[PDB]
């Protein structure tokens, strides 16, 4: 295995906070990003 491999993951896990187009990226304790922007939708006579 890569000697520093896991260490890299840790740095990639907690640092985050890069401010780009999608907003603010910050991975949670087990992977998938958290605090994403969502838009609610409703159907209205075959419309969105």
């Amino acid at each position: 295995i890569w000697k520093t491999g896991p260490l890299f993951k840790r740095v990639l896990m907690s640092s985050k906070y890069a401010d780009g187009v999608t907003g603010r990226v910050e991975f949670n304790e087990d992977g998938d990003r958290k605090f994403a922007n969502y838009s609610i939708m409703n159907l209205q006579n075959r419309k969105l």
Partner: antibody
Framework: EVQLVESGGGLVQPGRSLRLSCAAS????????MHWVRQVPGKGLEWVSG????????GYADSVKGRFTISRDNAKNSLYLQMNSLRAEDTALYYC???????????????WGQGTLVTVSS | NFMLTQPHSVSESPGKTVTISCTRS????????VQWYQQRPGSSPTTVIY?????PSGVPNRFSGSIDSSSNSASLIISGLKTEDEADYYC?????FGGGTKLTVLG
């Protein structure tokens, strides 16, 4: 919104120690990093030091390397600069300014403060 | 490293467009980024141009930033308007600031 205040400047004889404190208000303190930049009367400005978003990534210049120390406390939203064993050519202003990204490798600055006056002379 | 060199000062009558540039001594000018800062005398500097050619929020347009290779320099072509907007300007690339040029409105 983004307002920065700095304090702690005054007349200091050479060889003594000083500590400046910069308080901030408005924006969230846990998302951005800040630098400390200084001018020179008549001359331009020069980079001194810059802190990371939380800690760790500390940037130092050549002359200031080792002499100074920079730290921050995210709980009270303030920056602290401690200086000891100064020199006569380090008498100038000092600006507490915030960056744009979440680090300092970009060397970004936006919405600065107002400056202080630290003089090292006999 | 390198030394960012710019002319000491420029002055023009109101109503004319003027270009202000600083020249990179060594290396490619476009290899890094260049930003421009405006500071009224006595007061504190504020952002006017960041990230090559980008206008920060609150800037009322009317500003342009050219980073053409030319003779290894980047310039701003500011259109004709004087009012009270005439102060010292600085250009910064990486940890290195410009010499310092100020605009003078002719009286």
């Amino acid at each position: 919104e983004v307002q920065l205040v700095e304090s702690g400047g005054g007349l200091v004889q050479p060889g003594r120690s000083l500590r400046l404190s910069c308080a901030a208000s408005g924006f969230t303190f846990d998302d951005y990093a800040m630098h400390w930049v200084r001018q020179v009367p008549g001359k331009g400005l020069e980079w001194v030091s810059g802190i990371s978003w939380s800690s760790g990534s500390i940037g130092y210049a050549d002359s200031v390397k080792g002499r100074f120390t920079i730290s921050r406390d995210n709980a009270k939203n303030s920056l602290y600069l401690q200086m000891n064993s100064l020199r006569a050519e380090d008498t100038a202003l000092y600006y507490c300014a915030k960056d744009r990204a979440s680090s300092w490798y970009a060397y970004g600055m936006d919405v600065w403060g107002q400056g202080t006056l630290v003089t090292v002379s006999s | 490293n390198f030394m960012l060199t710019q002319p000491h000062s420029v002055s023009e009558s109101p109503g004319k467009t003027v270009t202000i540039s600083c020249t990179r001594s060594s290396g490619s000018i476009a290899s890094n980024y260049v930003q421009w800062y405006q500071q009224r005398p006595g007061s504190s500097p504020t952002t006017v141009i960041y990230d090559d050619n980008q206008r920060p929020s609150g800037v009322p347009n009317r500003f342009s930033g050219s980073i053409d290779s030319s003779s290894n320099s980047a310039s701003l072509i500011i259109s004709g308007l004087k009012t009270e907007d005439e102060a010292d300007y600085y250009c910064q690339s990486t940890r290195v600031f410009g010499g310092g040029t100020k605009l003078t409105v002719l009286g």
